[PDB]
Amino acid sequence: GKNIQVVVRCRPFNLAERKASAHSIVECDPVRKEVSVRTGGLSSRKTYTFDMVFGASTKQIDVFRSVVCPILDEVIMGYNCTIFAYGQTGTGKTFTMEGERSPNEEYTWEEDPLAGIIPRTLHQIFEKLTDNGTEFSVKVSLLEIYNEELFDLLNPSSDVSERLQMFDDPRNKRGVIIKGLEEITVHNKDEVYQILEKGAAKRTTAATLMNAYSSRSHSVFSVTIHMKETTIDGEELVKIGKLNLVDLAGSENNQSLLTLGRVITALVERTPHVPYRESKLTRILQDSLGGRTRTSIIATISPASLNLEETLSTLEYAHRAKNILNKPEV
Ligand SMILES: Nc1ncnc2c1ncn2[C@@H]1O[C@H](COP(=O)(O)OP(=O)(O)O)[C@@H](O)[C@H]1O
Numbered sequence: 001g002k003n004i005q006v007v008v009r010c011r012p013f014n015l016a017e018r019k020a021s022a023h024s025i026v027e028c029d030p031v032r033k034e035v036s037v038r039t040g041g042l043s044s045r046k047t048y049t050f051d052m053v054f055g056a057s058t059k060q061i062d063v064f065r066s067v068v069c070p071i072l073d074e075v076i077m078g079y080n081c082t083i084f085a086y087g088q089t090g091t092g093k094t095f096t097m098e099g100e101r102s103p104n105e106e107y108t109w110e111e112d113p114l115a116g117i118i119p120r121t122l123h124q125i126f127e128k129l130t131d132n133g134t135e136f137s138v139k140v141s142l143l144e145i146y147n148e149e150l151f152d153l154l155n156p157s158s159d160v161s162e163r164l165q166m167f168d169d170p171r172n173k174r175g176v177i178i179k180g181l182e183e184i185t186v187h188n189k190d191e192v193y194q195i196l197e198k199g200a201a202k203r204t205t206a207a208t209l210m211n212a213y214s215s216r217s218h219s220v221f222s223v224t225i226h227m228k229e230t231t232i233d234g235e236e237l238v239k240i241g242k243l244n245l246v247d248l249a250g251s252e253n254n255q256s257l258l259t260l261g262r263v264i265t266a267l268v269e270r271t272p273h274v275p276y277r278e279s280k281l282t283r284i285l286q287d288s289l290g291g292r293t294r295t296s297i298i299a300t301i302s303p304a305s306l307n308l309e310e311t312l313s314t315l316e317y318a319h320r321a322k323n324i325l326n327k328p329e330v
């Protein structure tokens with residue numbers, strides 16, 4: 001058991017994989033928490049074991065309830081947590097972390113069944129803290145890391161080529177200060193959608209003008225909750241919660257992903273001198289990874305033979321981050 005959790009989500013087939021005659025090579029056993037890959041067919045097949053395994057049938061709501069809700073509970077109690085989406089471009093990192101809008105109908109009191117972790121997170125924060133009388137405020141920031149350089153995606157008025165500078169925080173040795181990072185106040189439950197729209201417009205502008213392609217860059221979405229909870233005949237709680245929702249660069253890409261791997265592996269194995277400072281991303285997230293809290297990695301994969309090499313590469317990366325023994329085959 002552990003505060004570091006590694007899970008695998010397999011997306012269903014697209015149409016390019018079906019027409020190209022590609023065949024499914026991945027077996028996901030949620031009950032046994034196992035992913036099996038036909039590397040030869042019928043000979044052998046390689047089995048991996050993880051903390052949870054979500055098959056191609058998994059809905060967004062199930063990912064949120066299983067992975068995020070236990071973590072969001074710790075955030076609302078006043079801790080800093082991080083959830084990663086790792087995997088090959090096109091396997092569902094952004095779909096899992098952010099989700100999509102359904103063009104049919106219009107969800108208002110109901111969550112879009114395609115909404116991802118970020119919208120469901122903000123909606124649960126607003127509904128839970130309003131329902132229990134908490135005096136609370138919410139801030140969100142969104143930055144992008146390309147070529148080890150930081151770009152704010154929420155600054156309404158910056159110069160596209162302006163990169164954020166990062167300084168050590170004299171108050172907490174494990175924290176950093178991202179000078180100029182825009183932090184938008186979220187005033188109600190649904191405001192997150194227009195926030196993500198502004199960030200997407202800044203993202204494509206940075207792509208067209210600076211070649212900062214979103215498939216090759218990390219996206220760090222941080223939600224900060226300041227909380228004052230008053231209970232007559234109880235206590236007055238002043239809490240600050242922080243959840244970083246990290247949509248990583250495509251894993252087919254270079255060293256910052258391997259640095260993130262060495263950090264998680266070191267946190268799992270409890271080896272000294274976790275190499276936080278060897279990459280910008282892990283230095284950003286040190287205060288949420290260092291202080292003992294909950295961290296989850298959602299490793300996304302494709303089931304088609306077309307992507308065999310990168311799927312094996314992803315499972316190997318997730319296995320190296322948290323090595324769990326395979327239970328004896330039945
Ligand atoms: N679990 C899933 N269920 C249904 N569709 C998915 C799933 N994961 C990914 N997709 C679809 O695959 C396409 C690419 O996914 P995307 O989120 O862009 O992957 P990535 O962000 O890793 O590049 C999108 O059209 C998305 O809707």
Ligand SMILES: [Mg+2]
Pocket residue numbers: 093094095215247
């Ligand atoms: Mg993406």
